From a paper:
SbtA, which is ubiquitous in cyanobacteria, is an inducible high-affinity sodium-dependent HCO3– symporter within the TC.2.A.83 family of Na+/solute symporters. The sbtB gene from the sbtA–sbtB operon encodes a PII-like signaling protein that senses the intracellular level of the secondary messenger cAMP that correlates with high Ci conditions, versus AMP at low Ci conditions, thus functioning as a Ci sensor in cyanobacteria. The tightly packed trimeric structure of SbtA is exclusively stabilized by the gate domains at the center, with a threefold axis perpendicular to the membrane plane. In summary, this study provides structural insights into the cyanobacterial high-affinity HCO3– transporter SbtA, which exhibits a new architecture of Na+/solute symporters and its fine interaction pattern with a PII-like protein SbtB.
Here we purified Synechocystis sp. PCC 6803 SbtA and solved its cryo-EM structure at 3.50 Å resolution. Notably, the TM4 and TM9 helices in the core domain are unfolded and form a crossover at the middle. In the gate domain, TM1 and TM6 are divided into two helical moieties, forming a kink at the middle. Structural analysis showed that SbtA of a 5 + 5 fold is topologically similar to Neisseria meningitides ASBT8. The trefoil-like helical bundle of the gate domains possesses a completely buried interface area of ~3000 Å2, mainly via hydrophobic interactions. Structural analysis revealed that the substrate-binding sites of free SbtA are inaccessible to the solvent from either intracellular or extracellular side. Thus, the structure of free SbtA represents an occluded conformation. Substrate binding most likely promotes SbtA to adopt an occluded conformation, as seen in our free SbtA structure with a Na+ bound in the pocket.
Author numbering:
A (entry chain C), B (entry chain B), C (entry chain A): 1 to 166, 212 to 371
Write the structure that this text describes.
C-alpha cells in the first residue's frame, strides 16, 4: 500500500524499457533527417512471424488448460471487445464538424495489441512479484477478431441506410495478411505440437523483432501526427483519455471473475491493459480493405502516435499500482 | 519386436511434428483464400543459409572422421544416386501418352532433400533410442550432385540423337544459386574452422527457417496439384509408390555395410530415407536452366506436393520400425 | 618472449577463423561463376542491425564506467583519427599522374571498422590470455565520426580554392543511413536500459550476420580489384603498407596511456588495431554523397579488397605478439 510517489519512479523506469525506448527513439531521429529506411520486404516478414508467436502462444495455452476456467474471462472479453466500438459510436460521434462516422467508427479500432500488453505488461508483470495464469496470449484472438468486424459491419450498414437507401462482410477481413497469419498460429497451436520450433525460433527473437517494428512505427509517426493537425482537435482528446477510461470499465468488469471463477487478481491486470491498447499490426491491414472510405490518418495517427505511447505510458504502471493496492 | 499397431500411433504423432505440420498447414489456408505472401527477397535468403548449414555439417564431418569407414557408404550412395534416374527412364517412360521423356527424366529428380531426412529423420532417429554416426549430412552432397547431372546428361543426349541428329553440361548446373551455396559450405567445412558461426547462427535457426520454407512450398502447392490434373494420371501413381520402392532397394543395399563395416544399423536408416526423398530446394533451380524443355509442373508437382508428404508420411515411421525389428 | 616462429602459426590459424574465411571464400567462388546473389533488401538490414550492436555496446560502456579514465584514450583517438587523413594528404598526394586529390583524400578513409577489430581482435584478444577493458567498442564512434568529416571538409575546401575561386558540411554526412543507425545505438545505450534486447537479439546474431556481409564484400571484390588495374600502380602500395605504419604510430602513441592512465597494455592493442582498419560499412555510404567527384573504386577497392585482408592478415597477429613481448 504505497502512494503516487511509487508511480512516478515506475514511469521513468518504464519509459526506459527497450520497447517504448525505440518508439520515441524513432521520433527523435525523424525530426533530425535520417535517410535510414528499412525496406518493405523486411517489414512484411516482421508483421508475419510476430503474429505467429501470438497465435502459437494462445494455441498452446488451450491444450494444457481446462475449458472450465476460461469461460468467464473470454465472455468478459468478447463483450468487452464489442462494447468499445459502440461507446465510440456514441462518445466521439455527437461532436462538431469532424463527425465523419466512417472515419470515426474506425477510430474506435481499440482492440488488442502486440507491441504492448504481450511484451510490455507481461515483462513487467512477473518482473516484480505478482504472478498470472497460463493463458495471457490466449486473450489476444478474442477481443481482436470481434472488435474489428463490429467496426466494419456497423460502418458498412450505416452507409447503406444513408447513401444507397437514402458472412461476406467478415470474410474479406479475416481472409487477409496479418490476420490469417494469426489463425495459422492457433490451428498449429491447438492441434499439433510445435514445441521445438516455437521455443527456439519464434520465441527468442520475438522481443528483438518488436523493436525493429517499433522503429518503423516511430519514424512514420512524425509526419502523421503533424498531418493530424489538419483533421481535428478532438481526435487528440479521445486519444489521451480513452486508453484510461477503457481500463477502469474493464478492471471492475474483470473484478467479477475474481469473486466467482478464479482468475487471479494478477490476471485481471492482464485483462485490463489489453482493453486499452489501440491495435497497430492487425489493425490497419484490416479496416482499409474492409472500410475503404476511411481517411487513413484519423484512425492510425490516433493509435500509433498518441494511442500506444499513453497505453504504455500512464496505464500499465497505473494498473500495476492498482493491483498492488489490493 | 512390435507390429503395425505401433506404426499407426507413430504416423499420427509424426504428422503432428512441426515440419510437416506447416506444409499441410499451408495447403489448408490456401484453400481458404489467404492474401498472405512472403516476399521474394526473403525466400532467396532462406534458400541460401539453409543450404549452408548442410554444407557446413557435411564439411565438418569429414575433418573429424577417418577416410576408411566412409568409402562403402558413399560408393553405395553415388551408385544409389545414378540408379534412380535410370530406373525412372525404364519405369515411367514405357507408358501411354504422357511419355515426354524430357518431362520424365526430370520427374526422376529423386536425389536428397533438406526438408526431410536432415530434420525429419535425424530428429526422430535420436528421439527414441537408436544412435547413428557423425556423417549424417555428409551423405547429402553425394547422391545430390551425381543424381541431378545424370538427369541432365541423359535428357540432353536423348534430344540430340532424335531432333538434331534425326564438362560444359555439368558446368551450368553446378555454377548456379542453391548449389554453389552448398559447395561454399563444404570448402569452409573441410578447410577452415567455423565452429563459432555454425553453432550460433546457422545451426539454431535452421529448424525454424525450414518452417517458413515449408509454408511457401505448402501454399504454392494447392494450385499446382490442381494443374497436375491436366498433365496425366500416371505421375500420381509414380509419386505414391516410388518413395516406397526406392527405400527397400536402398535398405537391402545398405545392409551390405552393416555386415562388412560399422556405419551401423542406425545409420542404414539414415541412408534409406535419404534415397526416397524427391529434392525441393536444390532441385528446381537446377533442371530448369539445364533442361529448358521441361514442362515445369510434372517434376515439381510430383515432388513437393505428393512426393515429400509421402516421404515423411509413410516411410520414415516405416524404416524406423524396420530398424526396431532387428 | 617468443620469436617470429610463433607468428606464422598464428597467421595460418587466424586466416582459418570464420570472419576472413568467408571473405576469401567469396572471392574464390566469384572467380568460378556463381549466379548466387543476396538481394538488396537483405544487405540493407545487415548494414543496419550490425551498426546498432556497435552503438549499443559503446553506449552501454559509458554508463557503467567512470569518465575519468576515458579521457586520454579518446583524446588519443580523435587526434589519431584526424591525423590519418592529413598524412595521406602528404604521403599519397605528391606522386605521379594518379594524384587526383579528391580521389586521394577519400583513399584516406582509414577510420574504424566493424568487420575486424570488434569481432576479429576482440575474439582473439581474450581467446588466449590477455584481458582488456570494458570500453572496447566505445572507441568505435570516436575515430570514425571525426575521421570521415575531415576527409570531406579538406577535399571540399580544396576544390573551392581551385575551381570556383581559380555545420552544413558535416550535416549531410551524419544525417544518412549507416551513420544515424549508429547514433541511434549510442543514445539508446547512454540513456535507456536495453539489456534485454541487446543480449538476445542484437548480440547473438552479430557474428553470424557479419559473415553474410563479408560474403557480399568478397564476391563484389573480384571485379573491383581487376578494375583497379585501370586506375594506378600506387594505390596498391599504399594499401599494403599503410595498415602497418598506422599501427606503430598508434602503438607508441598508445604507450603514453600505459604510463599515465589505467588503459592497460591489453587495451593498447585494442587501440592500435582499430587505427589500421580501412572502414567498410560506415565508409562508402558517406564520402559519396559528401564527396561526389569521387572515382568510386580508388577508395573502395583499396579498403575492402586489399585494405582489410591485410588488416586482419599481418597486423592483428603482429600486435598480439608485440603485446606478448612486454
Amino acid at each position: 500500500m504505497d502512494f503516487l510517489s511509487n508511480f512516478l519512479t515506475d514511469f521513468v523506469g518504464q519509459l526506459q524499457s527497450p520497447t517504448l525506448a525505440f518508439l520515441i527513439g524513432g521520433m527523435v531521429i525523424a525530426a533530425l533527417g535520417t535517410q535510414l529506411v528499412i525496406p518493405e520486404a523486411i517489414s512484411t516478414i516482421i508483421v508475419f512471424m510476430l503474429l505467429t508467436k501470438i497465435g502459437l502462444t494462445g494455441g498452446m495455452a488451450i491444450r494444457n488448460s481446462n475449458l472450465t476456467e476460461m469461460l468467464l474471462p473470454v465472455a468478459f472479453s468478447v463483450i468487452l471487445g464489442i462494447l468499445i466500438v459502440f461507446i465510440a459510436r456514441f462518445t466521439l460521434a455527437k461532436l462538431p464538424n469532424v463527425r465523419t462516422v466512417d472515419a470515426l467508427a474506425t477510430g474506435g479500432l481499440f482492440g488488442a495489441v502486440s507491441g504492448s500488453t504481450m511484451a510490455a505488461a507481461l515483462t513487467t508483470l512477473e518482473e516484480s512479484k505478482i504472478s498470472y495464469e497460463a493463458w495471457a496470449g490466449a486473450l489476444y484472438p478474442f477481443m481482436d477478431i470481434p472488435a474489428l468486424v463490429t467496426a466494419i459491419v456497423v460502418a458498412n450498414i450505416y452507409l447503406n441506410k444513408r447513401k444507397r437507401k437514402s458472412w461476406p462482410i467478415i470474410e474479406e477481413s479475416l481472409q487477409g495478411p496479418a490476420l490469417s497469419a494469426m489463425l495459422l498460429g492457433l490451428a498449429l497451436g491447438i492441434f499439433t505440437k510445435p514445441e521445438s520450433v516455437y521455443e527456439g525460433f519464434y520465441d527468442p527473437l520475438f522481443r528483438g523483432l518488436l523493436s525493429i517494428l517499433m522503429l518503423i512505427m516511430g519514424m512514420e509517426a512524425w509526419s502523421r501526427i503533424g498531418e493530424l493537425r489538419k483533421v481535428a482537435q478532438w481526435y487528440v482528446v479521445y486519444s489521451l483519455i480513452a486508453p484510461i477510461v477503457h481500463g477502469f470499465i474493464a478492471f471492475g468488469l474483470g473484478m467479477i471473475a475474481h469473486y466467482a471463477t478464479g482468475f487471479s487478481l494478477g490476471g485481471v491486470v492482464v485483462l485490463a491493459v489489453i482493453a486499452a491498447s489501440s491495435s497497430d499490426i492487425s489493425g490497419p491491414p484490416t479496416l482499409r480493405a474492409g472500410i475503404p472510405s476511411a481517411n487513413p490518418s484519423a484512425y492510425i495517427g490516433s493509435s500509433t502516435a498518441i494511442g500506444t505511447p499513453i497505453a504504455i505510458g500512464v496505464c500499465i504502471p497505473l494498473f500495476i499500482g492498482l493491483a498492488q493496492t489490493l
